Point group: D2
Chain length 342, copies 4
């Protein structure tokens, strides 16, 4: 049984590889562009060099011919489509590449599968990763469900609305075993440095090592996020893929997935500062270049639909996930891998 | 005062240029790719050649640099963005170009305007044309209004969903005077041959001239729609454009726009056969190559929101619109411009 | 269950592809597939509509050069034995200000076609003959008084020129790398009654026809007249494409071989205007004016040819006189205006 | 203070051009990158960048025209080092569309933005368009390449630099934009990407030394000739050309071949890397199918007379030290647990 991971070098993809190698007998294929950063997969290199259950396929979301070669030659039984331009902030000023990679990237994958299904009966389970950002700037005091209206908060958000409709459409039109996951915040030690809890943790680490004045730079703190560790999120994807295989997930079925621990962003900063010998002496300053034209600033979740379909809960406390992320930046700086403060 | 029409060579765009020339003192710019069909605009060639109030700008939806030159050099005061891959049936097998031209083409326009507004205060009214097709296979019995949830019935439908959220987003994010129109079926003598009422009118005219056996080939008829002549639709667009300029349409506001008259598809056929001397002798046959993986179905009746912002109603009878279209195909065959039966 | 040699024409709705379809139906036993985007102008193919409705030897496949998935479907489902790849943004002048779509459609479009073929060859042994249509504009602004041959240095005179250099190298590369039976044709000017209105000899004939019919002042608007072109009727060019296609099938044309192809008759642009004016009763009374908007940042202003390579591989010369090609084009525009299909004067 | 833009700032050459400009000029430096690109080559710059000391970052993608528009409009660099590309021929074969898009259209996206700004406002930057000796593809044996050598399409990458090269010349000739085009040989050293021949040989030796690989180096075609120089010599050539162009001594769109003095058959490069290793005499070399190419640009020997006639320049760094620096880089990475793929 063969699993393809798109976005293998990313936060979630690299951890899905780890999870599948430790918890299944699956062969794993990691899709990447050849020059993608190795930071998340260095621990997998020897195993890949040894051809022990995991291999790399070189393909770009934006090269349909590369994806054709991948599906024709590898025929993955299950696909975790995690590859995307994942960052809303750059999507404002680089919106064309965000729309191309996320919407057209996903159409390039799904159309490749559709044609191979018509020709040869290829019938893979296809995980299409959407985002809770399809709900953009959601009304306060209400929890999100799978029928909550979509709001375009950013080109990234619109790109994920596109990804989402494509996932549902290809399932509904061609009976491909797609399911769509509208994820809240999933984080932990491999969270990209640009995301809120990771830039806060990283700036604390920079401050502790004397690289930055003891002022954390932030954007809008009037925002509510639900967190869980990727190690929990990934189990939900694996458990959904099994149900999809067994016939229990309708083609194109959508699911909101999040943790149970929700925070106003000042509470996350306070948790991270409490892990620092010098937290009592570190201030916070809102700066203009971290603000957004529209902020999707409220993500609270009713998880009743997902828990009705799989037997799953988040096990890792959010304080441990955050501590892991702070130690990660501490370790990078100690080793001379000085990050941007961004 | 200068008006840009994207999709100038198309059904609606060509008729919008006629409306503005007859009813306003506006200078008119028609955007086109140089090789576009001239069928809808032969009657404007003379006055274009003579530089009388209308001019052509050569640009492509997929060439940002061509749109950059358009907005910088011409600075239209109002923009009717009608250019699209308009046909759902081809969108199934040519999905990438539908998504690229419709979503990214719209993003190319809106990001060009955005940057010009930030640099020089350029503040045009921007009609972003979406479609009732965003509602796709609508939930039987829910009242259909501007807050009904979208459904992705085709790559076309998803591309107009994309277009819709781009229009909304660029309005909300950057205070660009966008408004989004979700129009029901508009038709009349310039309806492209491929659309339902056009292919039926066209096949009847082929049968009346002995080019086809007296069998009309159709797809699914278990569909109900509102119809309006384009010349009514254009009035609604024009009147909205005035309200947007006056400050009365919030940036990014969306509007469903339905005709007065609703029909089952067999009833549209019955109206067309009754304009034929040989109507009593023509069979209708459903064939597979006209069937769609998903067939959209919505009763979009409720115009209470558009009627609240403009003094407007469809005035032209649908029977006259369908007769005009049948006569168009009769005239085309009579001139030896024999169309495909498609 | 009767199986025929199948020809695909990309650019079926264009000047050359429309005439290639006519040629194959009259002179061969081939089934013809016309590739088009559905909304493409019908002007050049109205006379085929009845035949196509009747499923008599010619069909339409809807695909876009920029939609790889659409081409995959076309090659997988139809497996044409021979491909005339004529589809392009064909016009240098618009390429200056719409350069990205010119580069995407011509270079990436051609790459989408060839990569689809490469993959079907490796999997299933699909081995079509592939005509990759390039342009003498690969030589851009060539040194004056010298004949072009196939080893003449390339020059980038426009985004269109660079797109056809890209198209040309892709044609040679897929041939040399994967043993796809490509050949590349670097054509001079081929014209006649379906020449698009924007090209020199077409705009000049169109303007004369507008003047005769009372739609224009007796001034023809032109750009740079210090330019040399070699002309042949498309009806002669398509014969060369056909005969080269048979030689590729036969193993006589190495994968990715390039050929310059052009007519016998070369002219300075004013001579072309005088030939067309001499076909008009209004001809002695019409002035010629250079206007800024028909000028170009760089003009590929010299195209004369050593045709020795193509004539050594096929038994072929242009037979239609250019005066007859030009007369047919003027009569086309007269007919168009008579029928109320009033063109732009562009 | 003069403003320099580097595209491909995170790459082998861009990152070293930033080092070179900071050390040798009073130029403000702008590094273009997509936000997620590898930090490997620029970690040593993060603190400078954080403290806004002469170097900054602008987020743009070659394939997003609007992002490049914001860059030239807002930042108006006086000099541009266009080094960003899909740089690798091997992946270009099976990922050809992205190579063509990023390299040809990416360059068009840059040059068209500059054209429109020059027309409107008189923006007149110097524009280094980096091409490749691979425009000459599979060249004739026994003959040096020069600027008039016939072009040959050896790979989608090769064709993508042919496109890039013609765009460089065209935008210069058509619009009098101060472009120059550089068709480089092999420039290498410690930041050389792991997939390239001398970097994969040197990396595989390091994996063998540290016990991560059997003592067999996997290679492709060894019947190939290359001319090497250290990137620290190449970047000096680009800089000197940028001064000449600013003075008005480089015709708009002028092309230059640039390469070092030291040429080698590939086996000779392997033998120099093995002699740096205590395990040298013990390691086999095995040609493998998955490193072979449909066409190989087999032969890169250079006539450098044109470049030496326009700037006062030659390669100074011996290629032996260049390869030593590369081998020691892969030793350090492995010793620090940054275990590379063996590809
Ligand atoms: N982690 C979260 O909190 C969160 C929230 C909601 C949704 N998601 C979604 O989950 C998925 C994975 O998130 P992540 O945190 O791992 O993101 P990430 O940024 O860490 O990883 C993105 C991956 O996509 C790859 N990629 C980008 N462009 C590509 C292209 N053109 N071709 C091929 N690969 C390309 C990158 O190289 C990388 O491996 C994404 O779709 C993201 O939008 C994440
Ligand atoms: N008429 C209806 O029933 C209806 C219903 C809902 C929405 N709409 C929307 O109304 C608009 C106009 O409809 P129509 O009937 O006139 O369609 P049409 O097909 O007649 O017009 C399409 C136009 O877009 C242009 N276009 C296509 N691709 C282009 C590109 N790459 N660059 C530039 N121009 C390009 C075409 O040349 C043509 O002018 C479309 O956006 C359509 O989706 C129409
Ligand atoms: N006729 C000449 O004098 C001449 C000279 C040298 C080169 N050529 C080349 O010969 C070929 C044919 O010339 P022509 O006069 O017939 O050109 P044309 O402009 O009449 O036709 C071009 C064709 O390409 C199609 N096309 C354009 N973009 C497309 C896309 N995105 N997807 C699908 N189809 C698309 C058009 O619809 C049309 O059918 C072209 O490649 C042209 O560059 C012609
Ligand atoms: N080093 C050599 O031996 C050599 C030889 C001849 C030519 N060249 C050319 O010199 C230049 C620099 O080479 P290098 O060794 O530094 O290459 P590299 O692979 O080390 O660097 C490539 C750079 O381009 C960037 N890039 C890739 N795609 C991008 C995109 N879509 N948007 C923005 N940036 C993108 C990468 O992120 C990276 O910064 C390239 O143009 C290369 O083709 C190199
Ligand atoms: N990335 C980022 N987000 C911030 C910052 N300060 C506040 N935020 C907010 O943190 C929330 C989450 O942002 P982010 O981590 O980028 O992930 P998102 O959920 O994908 O937008 C948003 O409401 C941001 O506006 C900051 O400095 N960086
Ligand atoms: N185009 C087309 N549509 C048909 C045909 N027969 C039935 N229909 C249906 O008529 C409805 C209108 O389709 P169409 O005219 O293509 O417009 P759209 O789908 O609203 O853009 C859809 O439900 C079609 O599936 C036909 O022969 N052609
Ligand atoms: N299209 C066009 N070309 C013109 C005109 N006047 C002169 N030319 C020149 O005629 C030559 C041929 O141009 P054109 O017909 O576009 O074909 P091409 O440039 O060879 O593809 C070029 O040298 C043009 O500069 C004109 O009015 N229209
Ligand atoms: N990258 C790479 N190239 C190899 C290998 N074995 C031989 N070569 C040859 O080494 C030469 C240089 O290739 P490369 O370093 O990829 O740089 P290029 O000059 O950009 O193709 C080419 O002739 C390759 O065919 C190998 O294992 N990896």
């Amino acid at each position: 049984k063969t699993a393809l991971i798109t976005g293998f070098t990313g936060q979630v993809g690299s951890q899905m590889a780890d999870f599948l190698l430790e918890n299944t007998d699956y062969d794993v294929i990691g899709m990447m562009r050849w020059q993608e950063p190795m930071d998340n997969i260095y621990h997998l290199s020897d195993r890949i060099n040894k051809k022990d259950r995991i291999s790399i396929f070189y393909a770009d979301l934006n090269d349909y011919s590369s994806l054709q070669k991948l599906f024709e030659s590898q025929r993955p039984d299950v696909i975790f489509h995690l590859a995307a331009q994942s960052y809303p902030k750059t999507s404002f000023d680089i919106p064309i590449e965000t729309l191309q990679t996320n919407i057209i990237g996903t159409a390039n994958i799904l159309e490749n599968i559709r044609i191979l299904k018509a020709k040869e009966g290829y019938d893979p389970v296809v995980h299409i990763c959407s985002s809770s950002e399809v709900y953009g700037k959601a009304k306060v005091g209400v929890k999100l469900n799978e029928e909550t209206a979509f709001h375009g908060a950013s080109p990234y958000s619109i790109s994920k609305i596109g990804t989402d409709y494509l996932g549902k459409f290809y399932g509904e039109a061609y009976n491909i075993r797609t399911f769509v996951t509208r994820m809240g915040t999933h984080s932990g030690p491999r969270r990209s440095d640009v995301f809120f809890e990771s830039t806060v943790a990283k700036q604390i680490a920079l401050i502790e090592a004397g690289y930055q004045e003891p002022v954390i730079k932030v954007g809008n703190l009037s925002s509510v996020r639900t967190f869980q560790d990727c190690r929990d999120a990934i189990r939900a994807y694996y458990l959904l893929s099994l149900e999809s295989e067994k016939g229990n997930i309708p083609c194109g079925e959508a699911f909101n997935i999040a943790g149970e621990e929700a925070f106003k962003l000042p509470e996350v900063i306070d948790i991270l500062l409490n892990f620092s010998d010098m937290g009592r002496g570190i201030e916070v300053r809102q700066v203009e270049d971290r603000m957004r034209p529209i902020d999707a600033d409220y993500q609270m979740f009713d998880n009743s639909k997902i828990k009705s379909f799989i037997d799953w809960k988040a096990e890792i406390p959010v304080r441990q996930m955050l501590k892991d992320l702070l130690n990660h930046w501490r370790n990078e700086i100690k080793r001379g891998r000085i990050p941007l403060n961004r």
